[PDB]
Amino acid sequence: LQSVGQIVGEVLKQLTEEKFIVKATNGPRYVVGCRRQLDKSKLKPGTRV
Amino acid sequence: ENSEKIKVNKTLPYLVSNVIELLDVGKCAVIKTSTRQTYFLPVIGLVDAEKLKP
Amino acid sequence: PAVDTAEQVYISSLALLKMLKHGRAGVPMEVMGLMLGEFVDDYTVRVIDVFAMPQSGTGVSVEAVDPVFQAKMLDMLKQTGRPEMVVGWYHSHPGFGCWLSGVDINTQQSFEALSERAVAVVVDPIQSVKGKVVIDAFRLINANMMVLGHEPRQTTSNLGHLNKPSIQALIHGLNRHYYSITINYRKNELEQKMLLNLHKKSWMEGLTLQDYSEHCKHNESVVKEMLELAKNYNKAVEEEDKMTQDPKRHLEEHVDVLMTSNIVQCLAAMLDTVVFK
Amino acid sequence: VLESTMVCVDNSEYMRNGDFLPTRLQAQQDAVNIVCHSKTRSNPENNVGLITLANDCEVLTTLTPDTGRILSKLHTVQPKGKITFCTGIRVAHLALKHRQGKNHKMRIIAFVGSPVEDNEKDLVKLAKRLKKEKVNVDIINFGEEEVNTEKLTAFVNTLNGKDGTGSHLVTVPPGPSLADALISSPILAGE
Amino acid sequence: LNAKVRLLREELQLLQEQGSYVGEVVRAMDKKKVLVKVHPEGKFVVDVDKN
Amino acid sequence: AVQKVVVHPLVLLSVVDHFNRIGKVGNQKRVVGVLLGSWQKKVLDVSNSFAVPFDEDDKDDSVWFLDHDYLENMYGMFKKVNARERIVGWYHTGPKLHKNDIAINELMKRYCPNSVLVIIDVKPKDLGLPTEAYISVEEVHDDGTPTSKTFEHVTSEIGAEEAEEVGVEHLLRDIKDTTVGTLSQRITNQVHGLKGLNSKLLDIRSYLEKVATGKLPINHQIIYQLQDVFNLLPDVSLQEFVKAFYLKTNDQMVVVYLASLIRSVVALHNLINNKIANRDAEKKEGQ
Amino acid sequence: CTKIINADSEDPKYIINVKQFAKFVVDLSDQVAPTDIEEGMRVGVDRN
Amino acid sequence: EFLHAQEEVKRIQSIPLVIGQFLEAVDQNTAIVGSTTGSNYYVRILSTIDRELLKPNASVALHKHSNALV
Amino acid sequence: SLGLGLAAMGTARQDVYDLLKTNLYQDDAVTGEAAGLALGLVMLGSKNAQAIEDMVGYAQETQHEKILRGLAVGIALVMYGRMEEADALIESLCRDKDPILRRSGMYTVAMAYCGSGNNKAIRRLLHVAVSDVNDDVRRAAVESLGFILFRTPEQCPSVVSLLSESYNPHVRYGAAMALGICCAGTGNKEAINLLEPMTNDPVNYVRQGALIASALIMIQQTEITCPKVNQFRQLYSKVINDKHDDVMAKFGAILAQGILDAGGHNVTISLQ
Amino acid sequence: TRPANHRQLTFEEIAKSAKITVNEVELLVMKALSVGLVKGSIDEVDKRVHMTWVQPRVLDLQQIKGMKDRLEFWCTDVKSMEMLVEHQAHDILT
Ligand SMILES: [Zn+2]
């Protein structure tokens, strides 16, 4: 009951290590940070997050 | 007491939505809210996980 | 009697931190809680601590107080050694401003009926970006007083003013139904030192050396940039003095960074060579 | 009579002694159940907690008005280690002081069947101290009577002082039934 | 130094102030009122400021 | 086991407030509470805490009354408020341990298998963090010595949620330092580093004094680590190192020289402009 | 109201189809005639 | 205090910004943008965002709340 | 309590002091503020060790910021006219962690080194005007600076020209009020030159302070004596007759008129 | 025993130590490094061995008194350098 859902989006541009352009499905495009433990190189243009 | 609290927290005005995609990691969801929106749920919630077919 | 524009709500460090934690730990759902505090004489509302309320689903209202939980945990806090009354309530408004809506007004009216000093505080975690705490206290204006032409709150001193009311609160009726109380923070020296411990640097990082290859690369990069700015500044001085700024300013910034970095590392190396043998 | 009681229970190895049918463990379980129920029936506002006397003392249940939880938490008590009576009693006094309801008399009934290996001087000092803080330490002796009877008499005499019926000693060398011995005892008679 | 600090602070204030919509004036109906259509939502009649 | 524990500003403030209120109502050397947090690998995140009623006989040193019922009730209500915070340990605001710490950790291990003590010193120091973390490990000493159930130190750190960082920064806005290296502050940081190194070396020397005289026994892990430290001390008189050191110092000094030359030329330009402006102003005033 | 969810006898739990906005599962409120609801009857619904 | 103000500006040039298309420059330190949300705003430009590079119809990040081009 | 303190100002009557002590020994802001201020007025100059001890102890032990303010002004008045005998108390109050008590320390500096131009006190106040964190204490420090320098009116504008151009509005207001106290009933020219731009500020209370200081300075001044008095009279009239002018700016203008025409053009303000 | 200043052990030194002629000190050091007892290298052209590590072991009270003396010296040096830096930069310390 205390688990707020996320919003699915797609990576687009692969900015600097800590910056990713992500387009939210049926929504706008943001520049977002990545969770530390999530680890990187698994988020390439088109990847679902 | 626990069931009463769950009943109070399941206040009626739900948002009718789909279960477009179902994943595992426990189970998850990629529900499609009828507000033309898509929401990933890491925890399905109160539902019984009755196979919740896509 | 008339409450004057001098009353202050003193939100303790622990109270404020708990408020912000609860807000950002339950966004977007409207989180709520009680204020274990104390009215001292007439101008003080000391919110010693806060008291989270379980998410009741039915938004924020009197229905979400869950009085049994209130009484049980208040009794047990008293057992712990925290005997404070409930001076009002707090509830978040995640991103849509810091004011009161109709349900908020009804709840605060109920709290005033319990005791006509309770303050309703609102925290907006979404716009509470680090460096700016958008929190605001409120109390309702009796419907009779405003129509009677008398001001909602007395004004006996210059304290209480110096606060610019928010446009959002105005358009939602800041002074027509309630009024914003001034929020003060009671910061103890021990608490401040504990807070400093958060980002306090370690003596290691104080005495450590930057990677030497990276240092050389940075020096070379900045010196090349400063070369380019030197050419630009030469052309700028020549042209301005022949026909009679950004180049000079950027060059000053680059020289400053170069000097500070190089001197710091040189001294750190000297200290290491001496101290570690 | 608004009462706050602490039932100290020995779970030392000597509870493996089987003089009381079927075992000393089951006998003490029945006795504690009976005494707790007797305390609760009279003025249910009374509250009862429970202490385990093992290699190191423990408090299984603080002062509560319920008895089923105390029974349930005692049922899983097994015989182990050795008794530390002084520490058990001090923990009981601390629990009494921390009891939520300050409008209760202070009682501690101790199933202490064991040879109490403690020094007589500090023993009498503890008894007098408890008398000073106005405690009533009732003591149920079933076991090494020949060893601990004089010390238990010291307990109760020092606690009573003069006309101090608060603290009592009940010794049961015979083993017909611990529960029946307790129910037909002065401690429960006044309730 | 005072001028520099004041400039930065004023920039901070004016930049953290909320943005503003852009609309197309259908017709300056009435004084102090302007029928304006704001993209993409409907069209309002705004009360123009005194500046 | 747990390799790291990160305590939070909210936990620190709550502990300080608990100690203050208890010492205001009465007098006690320690105050005790439960630490609530979550695990992410072997990195405990102590994100909350709550006090529990607790008193002991400071003379007996083995009689105490930690309230398990109060503990479980508060834990249940904190579960109701927030769910991703399970009991992960306990804390006591005592500068030093006591014989009761092992017993209370045994008590807490019933609520958490990996129960961790966190001593949060309300008295504010100046070199290290206010939190010391301990995990109770009892294992047959490969040393071959008698084994007793005792604590073992756990690496501790202070971290903050973003919603706690905002509050911390706001509370410290008046006495905050710049989040940038200004030359004066960097030199000050180096001086503080020397201070910390000296204090740590003094502590090690005092421990060596005590163990050598005989007051304390030889701790083999301590001696191993000290041996490794002395092995790790560099050699700065080596010619091959002195030459590289002088080379790097000369490179840094030439960069500094170029910087200072540029700065002096800029200052001269500024003064030329000022002299010209003064000339213009005085000529205009005269005419 | 595109589906009365069978009315589950008691606890109706009506469904609504606010056009261009969303679908919802809602109930009545001070509806003095909880029977005159039908399906597709174009009911009025609050905002919050 | 000057260092603090600089740090505050560097901060408001934050991470969670919103993408949008800078449409044109109205005046100095102010311009019109169209955010990917689908709405057009008259926002304020921060200082030193290379107005030379800031050409019409350019991808730019916007402050999530004030929509300022940062 | 206020009336009795005013009536017994400087008398140091033991009975009045003890009655005021009893009235102060409660938990109530309205009574405690007056009780403390009247204690200060009664003990003024006496340097009574008992008075200082009792007032500081109650200030430290109380919980009402209003009582704290009253006791702050009271201690300041108590340690009046004592040039160097006030330094121990000044150091104690300045090092105290209660911001109201630090303000009390600023006021103690002012009262002790009143009208002496003591450079040590000026240095202390100027240091606290920029090092301290509490804007209240900064403003009190600037006011104390004016109180110290009132004897040499030409001297103060040199100090306060820079303070008036401060990014801290509280320090700006303190600068204005310090100029007012220093050049009260003097009608200096550079002081008015500094006040006028401050009279035109975007901050609310800086304008009030500037207006009141200008009234203090130009009290009993004619157009010929100061060719700006008519200008400030027009300014006061304009600010009073305005739509958006802030409440406190209007308050300051109204006061300014009152002081400027104080006593029916028959009384001036001079501290000596 | 050898301090980090002159940890350059020599073939002749190892010969005067555990009895072996200098034609297999090389093999002995190879065995030590391979087992992991020590770390470093062997410059047999100059006939010396560079040690940059040792496997720590358990020590005696006198072996710890020596460490205490070495610390004493290190603490003295650190304190002297601290005082020098603090006094020199006194006017710019924040
Ligand atoms: Zn609300």
UniProtKB/Swiss-Prot annotation, chain A:
Task: Report the residues modified as N6-acetyllysine.
Answer: K23
Top-level taxon in the UniProt lineage? Eukaryota
Localization in the cell: Cytoplasm; Nucleus
Q: Which family does it belong to?
A: Belongs to the AAA ATPase family.
What does it do? Answer: Component of the 26S proteasome, a multiprotein complex involved in the ATP-dependent degradation of ubiquitinated proteins. This complex plays a key role in the maintenance of protein homeostasis by removing misfolded or damaged proteins, which could impair cellular functions, and by removing proteins whose functions are no longer required. Therefore, the proteasome participates in numerous cellular processes, including cell cycle progression, apoptosis, or DNA damage repair.
- Describe, as the record does, how this protein assembles with itself and its partners: Component of the 19S proteasome regulatory particle complex. The 26S proteasome consists of a 20S core particle (CP) and two 19S regulatory subunits (RP). The regulatory particle is made of a lid composed of 9 subunits, a base containing 6 ATPases including PSMC6 and few additional components. Interacts with PAAF1.
Output this protein's name.
26S proteasome regulatory subunit 10B
Q: Which organism is it from?
A: Homo sapiens
Q: Which residues of the full protein are shown?
A: 50 to 98 of 389
From Swiss-Prot, chain C:
Q: Which Pfam families match?
A: JAB, RPN11_C
Q: Which organism is it from?
A: Homo sapiens (Human)
Q: Which protein is depicted?
A: 26S proteasome non-ATPase regulatory subunit 14
Q: Fetch the Gene3D superfamilies from UniProt.
A: Cytidine Deaminase, domain 2 (3.40.140.10)
Sites where the protein binds Zn(2+): H91, H93, D104
| Phosphothreonine: residues carrying this PTM | T244
Write out the function statement from the record.
Component of the 26S proteasome, a multiprotein complex involved in the ATP-dependent degradation of ubiquitinated proteins. This complex plays a key role in the maintenance of protein homeostasis by removing misfolded or damaged proteins, which could impair cellular functions, and by removing proteins whose functions are no longer required. Therefore, the proteasome participates in numerous cellular processes, including cell cycle progression, apoptosis, or DNA damage repair.
GO cellular component, alphabetical, reads: cytosol; cytosolic proteasome complex; extracellular region; ficolin-1-rich granule lumen; nucleoplasm; nucleus; proteasome accessory complex; proteasome complex
Q: Which InterPro entries match?
A: JAMM/MPN+_dom, JAMM_MPN+_peptidase_M67A, MPN, RPN11_C
Gene name, per UniProt, is PSMD14
Query: Which parts of the sequence form the motif JAMM motif?
Result: 91-104
Swiss-Prot record, chain D:
User: Keywords in UniProt for this one?
Assistant: Isopeptide bond, Phosphoprotein, Proteasome, Repeat, Ubl conjugation
- List residues of the VWFA domain: 4-187
**Keyword Repeat on entry:** yes
Q: Which GO terms describe its biological process?
A: proteasome-mediated ubiquitin-dependent protein catabolic process
Chain positions of cross-link Glycyl lysine isopeptide (Lys-Gly) (interchain with G-Cter in SUMO2): K121
A single Gene Ontology MF term assigned here is:
molecular adaptor activity
A single Gene Ontology CC annotation of this entry is: nucleoplasm
* Annotated coiled-coil segments of the chain: none
Similarity comment: Belongs to the proteasome subunit S5A family.
Question: Domain text from the record?
Answer: The 2 UIM motifs are involved in the binding to a multi-ubiquitin chain in a cooperative way.
Function statement: Component of the 26S proteasome, a multiprotein complex involved in the ATP-dependent degradation of ubiquitinated proteins. This complex plays a key role in the maintenance of protein homeostasis by removing misfolded or damaged proteins, which could impair cellular functions, and by removing proteins whose functions are no longer required. Therefore, the proteasome participates in numerous cellular processes, including cell cycle progression, apoptosis, or DNA damage repair.
Q: What protein does this entry describe?
A: 26S proteasome non-ATPase regulatory subunit 4
Curated annotation (Swiss-Prot), chain J:
- Point out residues bearing the modification N6-acetyllysine: K16
Stretches of the chain forming a coiled coil according to its record:
none
The source's superkingdom equals: Eukaryota
Please describe what this protein does: Component of the 26S proteasome, a multiprotein complex involved in the ATP-dependent degradation of ubiquitinated proteins. This complex plays a key role in the maintenance of protein homeostasis by removing misfolded or damaged proteins, which could impair cellular functions, and by removing proteins whose functions are no longer required. Therefore, the proteasome participates in numerous cellular processes, including cell cycle progression, apoptosis, or DNA damage repair.
Subunit note: Component of the 19S proteasome regulatory particle complex. The 26S proteasome consists of a 20S core particle (CP) and two 19S regulatory subunits (RP). The regulatory particle is made of a lid composed of 9 subunits including PSMD13, a base containing 6 ATPases and few additional components.
Q: Which family does it belong to?
A: Belongs to the proteasome subunit S11 family.
Name assigned to this protein: 26S proteasome non-ATPase regulatory subunit 13
Organism, by scientific name, is Homo sapiens (Human)
